Structures are given as C-alpha cells and as structure tokens.
C-alpha cells in the first residue's frame, strides 16, 4: 500500500526516522526496501530529529509484505525481540542489499528474532551477524522460507549455541525439529 525507503515519500531518507514513521500506519505492503539504521535511535544532530520512541515501533505490526529487502542494523535497547514484525509474512526481495541479501540482522542486543509470521522469503540471502544476545536463529530451517534455488544463510559472529542452552532458551518440546522464533510454544514453525 505504501512505498519503502528511497521510493516516493522517502526520496531523501536513508532510514526510518521520526519524521517518516507516521506514514506506515495501517499499511499492509511495502513497495520497496526498509532501512533501519542506527540514526533512528541515536538521533540526527543535523536535523534535530529525536530518537524514535521504542514503543512507537508497534506501528509496523500491520505489515505483511515487503517487495524489496529488510535491513535492520539497529533496535531499541528496551526490546528483547522483533515482534514489531510479528505479522510480516513475505519478503520478495526483487531488490537486494549489494545484490545478495534480502534479510540482514546486524549487531543487535535482541534475545530472539520473533519473526513468527514470516513464512516465505522469495529471493535473496539471509545474513545474521554481530548479535551477542540472539538465540533460536541457528535452529530455524530456512529452507521452508526459501523459493529460489541457492539461497544461503550466514548465522555468524553471534551468541554461542551452548550459551542459549545454558539459559534454557531453546525451542519447546511441542514443535518439530524445524526451529522456533522464541521460547514460547507459539513461536514454533510446525508441529
């Protein structure tokens, strides 16, 4: 319904700042790319833009479709997951970051991904790097979400596998060996 960063209403925007976030309410499809850069939480001193309130990211909970790629390089320190995208389902990825990645979660303090509704990733690779607190990512079977032969996943430089098992942050006994987006029995992809 609405465009993405760099297209249309976001012609001269590099990320989702406190100026253009108000245009995503009741939007179900993004016709472009979504950039979540660190400028959204440290603010912009040049434009006097304050940090986006961490309770304001719940506006994107109506999003279900992204034609381009989703680039997440920042997240509020108060939120442990990404359930602001708990209803996002499809990332087509006709346009990619450097022509390779359609989903990038880089250096976040999140404890879980929480992309529970994400069922399809049409085209593009998925890189998950630099997240010191993240879990559940290495258990997700990304072959279910893929649609193009050869889509790769880089789960690198993140929290150790035995580190998540030490805190009991694994998938529930009530779901398949396909993975989970969190500890709750609802985050499980299949059962």
């Amino acid at each position: 319904v609405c465009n993405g960063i760099g297209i249309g209403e976001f012609k001269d925007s590099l990320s989702i700042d406190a100026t253009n976030i108000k245009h995503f309410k009741n939007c179900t499809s993004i016709s472009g790319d979504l950039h979540i850069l660190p400028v959204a939480f440290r603010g912009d001193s040049f434009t006097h833009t304050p940090p986006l309130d961490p309770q304001e990211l719940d506006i994107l909970k109506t999003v279900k479709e992204i034609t381009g790629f989703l680039l997440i390089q920042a997240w509020p320190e108060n939120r442990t997951d990404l359930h602001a995208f708990e209803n996002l389902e499809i990332i087509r990825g006709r346009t990619k970051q450097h022509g390779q990645f359609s989903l990038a979660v880089v250096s976040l303090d999140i404890t879980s991904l929480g992309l529970r509704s994400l069922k399809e990733i049409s085209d593009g690779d998925v890189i998950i790097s630099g997240n010191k607190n993240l879990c559940y990512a290495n258990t997700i079977n990304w072959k279910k979400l893929f649609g193009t032969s050869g889509q790769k996943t880089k789960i690198i430089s993140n929290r150790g596998e035995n580190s998540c098992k030490a805190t009991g942050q694994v998938c529930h006994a009530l779901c398949s060996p396909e993975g989970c987006w969190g500890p709750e029995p609802r985050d499980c992809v299949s059962h």
Partner: antibody, heavy 119, light 108 residues
Framework: QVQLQESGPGLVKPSETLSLTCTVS??????????WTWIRQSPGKGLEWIGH???????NYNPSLKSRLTISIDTSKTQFSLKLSSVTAADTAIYYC???????????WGQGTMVTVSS | DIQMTQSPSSLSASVGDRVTITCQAS??????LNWYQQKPGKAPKLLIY???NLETGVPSRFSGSGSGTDFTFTISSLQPEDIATYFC?????????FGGGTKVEIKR
Amino acid sequence: QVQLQESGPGLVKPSETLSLTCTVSGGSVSSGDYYWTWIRQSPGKGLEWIGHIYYSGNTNYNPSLKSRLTISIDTSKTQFSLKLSSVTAADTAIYYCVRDRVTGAFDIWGQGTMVTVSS
Amino acid sequence: DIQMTQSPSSLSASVGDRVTITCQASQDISNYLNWYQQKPGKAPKLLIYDASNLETGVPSRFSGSGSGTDFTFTISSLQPEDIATYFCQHFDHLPLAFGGGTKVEIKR
C-alpha cells in the same frame, strides 16, 4: 584503497592502561558493512581476536579480555581506539587494527605495532 | 569456545610441489572458515574466505576446501615467495579464534 595505521605507546608499565588508536585512510568508518576489529599476536598465545565495534556503538569483546577492554569509535577523524587496563607481561604482543567485514573476513590489516609491558 | 587445530605445524617442500595443509575445528562451523598468509615481518593477508572463495588479487595456485570440521588449504605449485605461516580462522560464533598456524619453508 583503504589503509589502516596504528598509533600509541610502545612501552606500558604494569597494572596501567594500554591505549592505541587506528586511523582509517582512504575511506570512512561510518559504513555498516564492516566490524572495526583489534587483533594481537604474541609468542605463546598466537593470533588472538580482541574484539570489534560497530558504527551503531555496539561492541563485542573477547571473554578472556572482557573485564579490562574498551573499544570506541570516532567517526569525526575516521578513527577507532583501544584501551586495555591493568596490563601484565602477558599483554606484551604485536597489536593490529583490522577491518572485519560483516560477511566474515579480516580483509584489511594494519601494519602492526609492538607493545611491551615492563617496569 | 571453538578450538582450531592446524596440521602440520611446519613443513618443507621443493619449488613446484603441491602443498596441502589441514585445519580442524572442535565443532561444526559450516563453511565459516578463512585462510590467512603471514609473510615474515608483515601482517597477515587474507587469501581464502568462506573456506572456498579466492580473494581478488591472490594467485590462482592457492585454494581451499571443506565444510563442517575438516578443512584443507592447498598450494598447487609452491613458489619461493610463498615462504610464510598460514593461519585458519573461524567465524561461526563469538568469540572468533585462529588456528595455531602452519609454517611453510622451501627446500633448495
């Protein structure tokens, strides 16, 4: 292309703080595609990954040096520094500042600086 | 706490010989494995990333292979300029670590 260069004292007294600064030339430290990393090498420990910092401010430290480590970034003069407090003779090593791309590779290394811990 | 073991610790070969060194990880690291070359007195140089891909500018006589725990680095035709110590490095999860290194020398 992009070159890295180390700077800092070569002799640090024990129990004090080692300080080093890497100046990036021919590029900017403001790219979200790289982790700006410090790496040291010594006889007995070999190549050891100290830690890196992102341009968002997020840091990742080696648990063996976590308690005494602090890495910051100054995008103004395109630099990022290293601070290692309470040093002992075990910290005597050659220290490199390295550009680690998020893809996962130490593609650009500095020339390396020698740091000696001794009274 | 991934342990990287390189083998051998040192070797000697003639010019034009095929050199093959191995790197073994204590756990499955997929293909998150890189190879570095450190010539005497210089900083390490990246030659192979993602176990198999050749960095641009590196001669074609260098290659890498492997996935999981066992990896191999191969020099098809050894040259006198290849005198260096070769390291393998993983990036599966934090913290990142290097191998012990493999010193390569020329027999003449």
